[PDB]
Structure 1
Amino acid sequence: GSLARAGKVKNQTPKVPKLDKKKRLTGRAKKRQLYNRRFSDNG
């Protein structure tokens, strides 16, 4: 059959590049943020 179709869909899809984001928090800070989102003010 067809090995011609191998890599169809990916090729078809339009390359939208990532974009700038606010450099994420990491470790402790991130955890703190998560906590805040979940329990503290919303609770």
Structure 2
Amino acid sequence: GSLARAGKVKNQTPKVPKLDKKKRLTGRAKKRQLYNRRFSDNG
């Protein structure tokens, strides 16, 4: 058959940890922060 090359890319590719990061804002707080971030001045 031609079943030889199964699973190739994931095994081929380099795999790195994410690295640690502080817990995200959520909910009303995140939405409020987004609402301030977005809507004043672009640049």
Q: Same fold (TM over 0.5)?
A: yes
Structure 2 unmatched ranges of 5 or more: none
Instruction: Give the superposition deviation at 1:42.
Output: 5.2
Q: Once the two structures are aligned, what percentage of the paired residues are identical?
A: 100
RMSD, aligned α-carbons: 2.0
Between Structure 1 and Structure 2, how many residues are aligned? 43
Ranked by relative contact order (alpha carbons within 8 Å, sequence separation 6 or more), the top structure is 1
Q: After the TM superposition, list the runs of 4 or more consecutive aligned residues in structure 1 that deviate by more than 6 angstroms.
A: none
Distance, in Å, in 2 between the alignment partners of 1:42 and 1:31 is 18
TM-score, L = length of structure 2: 0.76
Distance, in Å, in 2 between the alignment partners of 1:41 and 1:33 is 14
Structure 1 unmatched ranges of 5 or more: none
